[PDB]
Amino acid sequence: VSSSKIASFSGTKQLLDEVGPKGVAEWVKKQDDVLLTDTTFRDAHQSLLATRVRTKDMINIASKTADVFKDGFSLEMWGGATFDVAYNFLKENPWERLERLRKAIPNVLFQMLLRASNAVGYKNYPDNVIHKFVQESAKAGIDVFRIFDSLNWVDQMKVANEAVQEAGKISEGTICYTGDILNPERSNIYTLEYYVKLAKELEREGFHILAIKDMAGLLKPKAAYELIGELKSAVDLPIHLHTHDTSGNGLLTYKQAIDAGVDIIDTAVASMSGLTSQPSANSLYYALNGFPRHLRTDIEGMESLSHYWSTVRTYYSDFESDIKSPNTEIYQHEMPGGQYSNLSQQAKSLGLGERFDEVKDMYRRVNFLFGDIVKVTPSSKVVGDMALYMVQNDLDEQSVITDGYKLDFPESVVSFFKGEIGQPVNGFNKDLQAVILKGQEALTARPGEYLEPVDFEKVRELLEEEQQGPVTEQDIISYVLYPKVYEQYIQTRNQYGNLSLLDTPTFFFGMRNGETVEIEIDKGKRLIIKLETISEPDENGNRTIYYAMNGQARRIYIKDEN
């Protein structure tokens, strides 16, 4: 879609500008149609393709996307694993992805998933790290930070929230769903009452939108009706609901929420939808014919996006999960997103492959042993690790306390009981916690308060010394969040240039004898490259590639590994 027509659109980005967040939220509650958020550039590929989808694939549809979602609520396109996975395996700057999308798609809010405690990183950071990162984020195009905490611990949310109000962007505060409010036997703790209370609190901390992050698709159809019923009546925030379709019941769940008057839902285009991804926006659209409320969107456009992503997905078949049918045992073990599969790529990978029916069981048991927690990242890793550990070590519920004194519990669990992921709803059992930390004191306060603010200035001088001259503030918090990885992003870039510019098939496979590829470098500067031959290796294993590149014969020397 021409860049000039796009310029003419005024969607929710414009509306933030006009009336602020406060004002965007109100406008949401006004609308009658269900508003939608697309997760194709983020959650959808995080679930289905190991978060491997590359910038180049997204920028190519950016402009058709901006048109199709002209009236949608946001595009979730950053946060989650994307930050880490872009620098690391993809070897490309997430920030450029944001920047470039931002210009391509100027009419729709950009949404990212913020982890209340540490943003996007992998450990704990002092608060001025959280703030810097949110400052620079909002400076680059994010308008809606969905802040969730991995134990529903409101306190750890206050800081990232404070950072968002400061940039005057939208702050989405997140309850994570567990248990089963339909079933009194499931929990004495995670009951309609808990959610309502927990929603009211969030409203007071002043978030604009209240979001429900059903991270394991545990939120059955009736339960969504009930749950959204009570929420819409205990709080005046718009409600923004996120399920996964891993039970197979996702559309049904959404159709139910809609009746209860949900405000926005998260959906994906058909071909990136399904199973452990979001429900299919295409499907929901038709599903609603005949009922009062209807999805606000462009199907004829969506069917077109679907077709694009259907083909592009192909470029990534090496990272597909083996989940290929819905799975309702997720109701027993509550494993989030991938884990059910992932944990299995782990249990054979040390020889309990034939006893995964035990591991899925221990998973359930370890949860309750930890007093029944909320299982997202990283709390889900802790449970996963215990489950493994205990089966491997012929361990049970009583004998973890008997033999504890002489057991190396995994770092993930010692770290949990140390207060380091945060504070669990129910607190810690004292006698388990004791056997696990073998003396070590626990934190008594969010792990944050504990840490010297970073010195962003010692970092610049370190990074400017090492590299070129021009270091940005994005270079800085990128370093801070991911030191080892960012260092490596920079080795590569120096060696190989800017890889994000390549097309995915060439990124992953290279070239075949005879083939001519084109890379668009800058505006009107492109490389036309043809691979003519690769010779036979020589005395010490160095093959000679014969290329032509821009009317120029060229010769490269590469180390073979037989």
Partner 1 sequence: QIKKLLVANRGEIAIRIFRAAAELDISTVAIYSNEDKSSLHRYKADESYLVGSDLGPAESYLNIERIIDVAKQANVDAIHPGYGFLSENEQFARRCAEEGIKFIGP
Residues engaged in binding partner 1 (CB under 8 A): 522-526, 528, 550-552
Residues in contact with 121: Cβ distance below 8 Å, sequence separation at least 6, in sequence order: 83, 84, 115, 129, 481, 482
Give the nearest distance from C-beta 498 to partner 1 in angstroms. Answer: 18
149 binds, among Mn ion, partner 1, a second copy, none (CB under 5 to 8 A by kind): none
* 3-class secondary-structure state, position 522: strand
Does a cis peptide bond (omega within 30 degrees of 0) precede residue 470? no
524 binds, among Mn ion, partner 1, a second copy, none (CB under 5 to 8 A by kind): partner 1
Give the up-direction half-sphere exposure of residue 220: CA atoms within 13 A in the CB hemisphere.
12
Q: What stretch of H or E contains 94?
A: helix 94-104
528 binds, among a second copy, Mn ion, partner 1, none (CB under 5 to 8 A by kind): partner 1
Q: Give me the residues paired with residue 144 across strands.
A: 111, 170
410 binds, among a second copy, partner 1, Mn ion, none (CB under 5 to 8 A by kind): none
247 binds, among partner 1, Mn ion, a second copy, none (CB under 5 to 8 A by kind): a second copy
Give the residue with the Cβ less far from partner 1, 198 or 549: 549
C-alpha 232/C-alpha 234 separation (Å) is 6
Give the residue with the Cβ less far from partner 1, 324 or 523: 523
Give the nearest distance from C-beta 507 to a second copy in angstroms. Answer: 23
Give the residue with the Cβ less far from a second copy, 179 or 279: 279
Q: Give me the residues paired with residue 75 across strands.
A: 38, 110
Burial 368-390 (b: 16+ CB within 10 A, else e): ebbebbbbbbbbbbbbbbbbbbb
C-alpha 257/C-alpha 217 separation (Å) is 14
550 binds, among Mn ion, a second copy, partner 1, none (CB under 5 to 8 A by kind): partner 1
CB contact at 8 A, 364 and 252: no
Give the nearest distance from C-beta 556 to partner 1 in angstroms. Answer: 19
Angstrom distances, CA of residue 282 to CA of 41, 255, 275: 16, 13, 15
Give the nearest distance from C-beta 526 to partner 1 in angstroms. Answer: 8
* The token pair that represents 85 in the structure block: 């996975």
Give the nearest distance from C-beta 290 to a second copy in angstroms. Answer: 3
Please report where in the chains the tokens 């965007």 appear, as a residue.
24
Give the nearest distance from C-beta 180 to a second copy in angstroms. Answer: 8
C-alpha 531/C-alpha 545 separation (Å) is 7
Give the residue with the Cβ less far from partner 1, 103 or 197: 103
C-alpha 427/C-alpha 537 separation (Å) is 63
Give the residue with the Cβ less far from Mn ion, 40 or 478: 40
Q: What stretch of H or E contains 174?
A: strand 170-176
Give the residue with the Cβ less far from partner 1, 552 or 562: 552
523 binds, among partner 1, Mn ion, a second copy, none (CB under 5 to 8 A by kind): partner 1
Residue 327 has what DSSP assignment?
A: -
Of residues 363, 375, 297, the one with CA closest to residue 333: 363
Give the nearest distance from C-beta 257 to a second copy in angstroms. Answer: 13
270 binds, among Mn ion, partner 1, a second copy, none (CB under 5 to 8 A by kind): a second copy
Give the residue with the Cβ less far from a second copy, 267 or 478: 267
325 binds, among partner 1, Mn ion, a second copy, none (CB under 5 to 8 A by kind): a second copy
Assign 3-class secondary structure to 397-452: CCHHHHCHHHCCCCHHHHHHCCCCCCCCCCCCCHHHHHHHHCCCCCCCCCHHHHCC
Site string for Mn ion, 39-58 (x = CB under 5 A): ----x---------------
59 binds, among Mn ion, partner 1, a second copy, none (CB under 5 to 8 A by kind): none
Give the nearest distance from C-beta 284 to partner 1 in angstroms. Answer: 37
CB contact at 8 A, 284 and 362: no
Q: Give me the residues paired with residue 554 across strands.
A: 547
Of residues 422, 427, 364, 420, the one with CA closest to residue 390: 364
Residues in contact with 221: Cβ distance below 8 Å, sequence separation at least 6, in sequence order: 249, 252, 253, 255, 256
CB contact at 8 A, 167 and 194: no
Give the residue with the Cβ less far from a second copy, 53 or 251: 251
Question: Which chain residues interact with a second copy by CB under 8 A?
Answer: 182-183, 220-223, 225-226, 247-249, 251-252, 255, 270-274, 279-280, 282-283, 285-287, 289-291, 299, 303, 306, 310, 324-329, 331
Give the residue with the Cβ less far from Mn ion, 51 or 107: 51
Give the nearest distance from C-beta 11 to partner 1 in angstroms. Answer: 25
Give the nearest distance from C-beta 242 to Mn ion in angstroms. Answer: 6
CB contact at 8 A, 397 and 371: no
Angstrom distances, CA of residue 443 to CA of 38, 151, 419, 422, 465: 38, 15, 5, 9, 36
Give the residue with the Cβ less far from partner 1, 440 or 550: 550
C-alpha 202/C-alpha 205 separation (Å) is 5
* 3-class secondary-structure state, position 100: helix
478 binds, among Mn ion, a second copy, partner 1, none (CB under 5 to 8 A by kind): none
Give the residue with the Cβ less far from partner 1, 514 or 524: 524
Give the residue with the Cβ less far from partner 1, 64 or 530: 530
173 binds, among Mn ion, a second copy, partner 1, none (CB under 5 to 8 A by kind): none
C-alpha 338/C-alpha 93 separation (Å) is 25
Give the nearest distance from C-beta 551 to partner 1 in angstroms. Answer: 5
Give the nearest distance from C-beta 227 to a second copy in angstroms. Answer: 11
Give the residue with the Cβ less far from a second copy, 300 or 465: 300
Give the nearest distance from C-beta 552 to partner 1 in angstroms. Answer: 8
User: Nearest residue by C-beta to Mn ion?
Assistant: 43
Residues within the interface to Mn ion (CB under 5 A): 43
